[PDB]
Paper text:
BLs are categorised in two distinct families, according to their catalytic mechanism, and further divided into structural classes (Ambler’s classification): class A, C, and D serine β-lactamases (SBLs), which utilize a catalytic serine for β-lactam hydrolysis, and class B metallo-β-lactamases (MBLs), which, in turn, require divalent zinc ions for catalysis. Finally, subclass B1 MBLs inactivate nearly all β-lactam antibiotics, with the sole exception of monobactams. This class includes variants such as IMP-1, VIM-2 and [name]-1, whose worldwide emergence has characterized recent decades. Here, we present the identification of a series of non-covalent scaffolds targeting SBLs and concomitantly MBLs, through a large virtual screening study, in vitro validation, microbiological analysis and X-ray crystallography.
High-resolution structures of compounds 24 and 31 in complex with VIM-2 and [name]-1 MBL have been determined by single-crystal X-ray diffraction at 1.60 and 1.38 Å resolution, respectively. In the binary structures with [name]-1 compound 31 orients similarly to 24, with which it shares the same sulfhydryl-triazole moiety. With respect to 24 in VIM-2, compound 31 in [name]-1 is further stabilized by hydrophobic interactions formed with Ile28/35, Val67/73 and His263/250, and by a hydrogen bond with Gln119/123. The zinc ions maintain the position they have in the apo form, as well as the coordinating residues, i.e. His116/120, His118/122, Asp120/124, His196/189, Cys221/208, His263/250. In particular, in the case of [name]-1 they experience a slight opening upon binding of the inhibitors, while in VIM-2 their position appears quite conserved. For compound 31, the pose selected during the virtual screening was actually the one most similar to the crystallographic pose but was not the one that received the highest score in silico. It should be noted that the amide sidechain of Gln119/123 is flipped in the X-ray binary complex compared to the structure used for docking simulations, allowing it to interact with the ligand pyridyl nitrogen. We can observe a slight shift towards His196/189, possibly because of the flipped Gln119/123 or, alternatively, for the absence of water molecules in docking simulations. The highest ranking was, instead, assigned to a conformation of compound 31 having the opposite orientation with respect to the crystallographic one. The most potent compound is 31, which demonstrates an inhibition percentage of 97%.
Residue numbers in the entry: 42 to 270
């Protein structure tokens, strides 16, 4: 049921939701998948995360034009690392309004990423301040606290069973929390737990580097993170 367009793979998760997957061949690891989301919101499309590269990101947009044929209104990118923000220039060239955590945009230059056009800010309880996320339709943006990076954010899709943990959440059989080069090992477990509590009825948990899982991914990630303190 999965579809290939250029270097990208797409999988439909729900009537109005698809996962996009892009690959980069890394020293040491070889080919590494990274996943984001595409959401049809009535007459428009919303994107979560770029692909690794601008070329791959343009392939997402072309697949959307071909298969969905609705304007892409905006994209939310989930932290300032290549897998999630590598394709910003491609979104900007296509005229898609981009949104990231303020902190992602502040870190972006140091991390070699291009900042988004707009900054999301968050309350103490993690929820986006709504004036910063105008007309986000079903996307509910949550900052769960520092974990994979200090700026990692997460998104739930209202009206669906789906929530996206990005690179904070690992699958429920994972052996480790993977890339911890920029991680907050002290607060990781609470941040994983906070994402779970923010989206308490999501049953399909989508994440950057494994296929969609159940809520078990959340509790497994938190259990692994507990051992880093
Ligand atoms: S996660 C996360 N954050 N940054 C990156 C990344 C890594 C290497 C180069 N550019 C970005 N990754 C993904 C990989 C996945 C497993 C190893 O790290
Ligand atoms: Ca670029
Ligand atoms: Ca870094
Ligand atoms: Zn990262
Ligand atoms: Zn990642």
């Amino acid at each position: 049921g999965d579809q290939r367009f250029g270097d990208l793979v797409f999988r439909q998760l729900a009537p109005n939701v698809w996962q996009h997957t892009s690959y980069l061949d890394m020293p040491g690891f070889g080919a590494v998948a990274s996943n984001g989301l595409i959401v049809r919101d009535g007459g428009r499309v919303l994107v979560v995360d770029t692909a690794w590269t601008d070329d791959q990101t343009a392939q997402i947009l072309n697949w959307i034009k071909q298969e969905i044929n609705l304007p892409v209104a905006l994209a939310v990118v989930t932290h300032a690392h290549q897998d999630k923000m590598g394709g910003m220039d491609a979104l900007h060239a296509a005229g898609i309004a981009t949104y990231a955590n303020a902190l992602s945009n502040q870190l972006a230059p140091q991390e070699g990423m291009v900042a988004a056009q707009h900054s999301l800010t968050f309350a103490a309880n993690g929820w986006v301040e709504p004036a910063t996320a105008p007309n986000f339709g079903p996307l509910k943006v949550f900052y769960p606290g520092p974990g994979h990076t200090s700026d990692n954010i997460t998104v739930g899709i209202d009206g669906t069973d789906i929530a996206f943990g990005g690179c904070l959440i690992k699958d429920s059989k994972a052996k480790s929390l993977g890339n911890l080069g920029d991680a907050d090992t002290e607060h990781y477990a609470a941040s994983a737990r906070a994402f779970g509590a923010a989206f308490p009825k999501a049953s399909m948990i989508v994440m950057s580097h494994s296929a969609p899982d159940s809520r078990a991914a959340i509790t497994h990630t938190a259990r692994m993170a507990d051992k880093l303190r």
